[PDB]
Nucleic acid binder design. Structure first.
Length: 183
DNA sequence: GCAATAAAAGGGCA
DNA sequence: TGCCCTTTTATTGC
């Protein structure tokens, strides 16, 4: 499903799961060495494991957010590890409603892009204010994905719940990027 | 750095 | 209510 011949690399996956049990965040932050907590700043225990390299946000409600994985599977594995860490800490954690919430992929078309012309020709979807952010923000409607397009030809694709939406957004924009290649 | 992007979870605030 | 709290990742250019 890659007519362009380029496959965006998945860079970050954000997922959530329900441990399905109330948690004592202070007890976790004290029992765990690999855990940061200060409710004055944020309501979650921030934990990190080395493989898959991720960061979890564990809340008192038993709900948990997993960030930093390079794939959906790796995010699910990381999440299972935190839930087991939580269980070994004494809480009857379960593993329910695991869902992929956001997928960030990036790629390189390897040719310069004329961001102003592209923005202008696609005003309905584009936001280009280089003084604020040097990347053109392309809010695609089908699929509903947001792409950050840079002069260098590097592209950031975010907002997908499935990797296929990521791949399709890239394929949809490729013809457009080529059209505004900077010569 | 740090700017903006997307997304989730919660406590706090006006 | 709503919006930021924090975390992650790619990115260019100040």
């Amino acid at each position: 499903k890659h007519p362009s011949g380029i496959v965006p690399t998945l860079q970050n996956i954000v997922s959530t799961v329900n441990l399905d049990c109330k948690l004592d965040l202070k007890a976790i932050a004290l029992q765990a060495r690999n855990a940061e907590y200060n409710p004055k700043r944020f309501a979650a225990v921030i934990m990190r494991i080395r493989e898959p390299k991720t960061t979890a946000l564990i809340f008192a409600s038993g709900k948990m957010v997993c960030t930093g994985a390079k794939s959906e599977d790796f995010s699910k594995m990381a999440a299972r590890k935190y839930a087991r860490i939580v269980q070994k800490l004494g809480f009857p954690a379960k593993f329910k409603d695991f869902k992929i919430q956001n997928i960030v992929g990036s790629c390189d078309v390897k040719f310069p892009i004329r961001l102003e012309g592209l923005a202008y020709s696609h005003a309905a979807f584009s936001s280009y204010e280089p003084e604020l952010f040097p990347g053109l923000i392309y809010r695609m409607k089908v699929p509903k994905i947001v792409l950050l397009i840079f002069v260098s030809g590097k592209i950031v694709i975010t907002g997908a719940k499935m990797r296929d939406e990521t791949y399709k957004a890239f394929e949809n924009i490729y013809p457009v990027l080529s059209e505004f290649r900077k010569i």
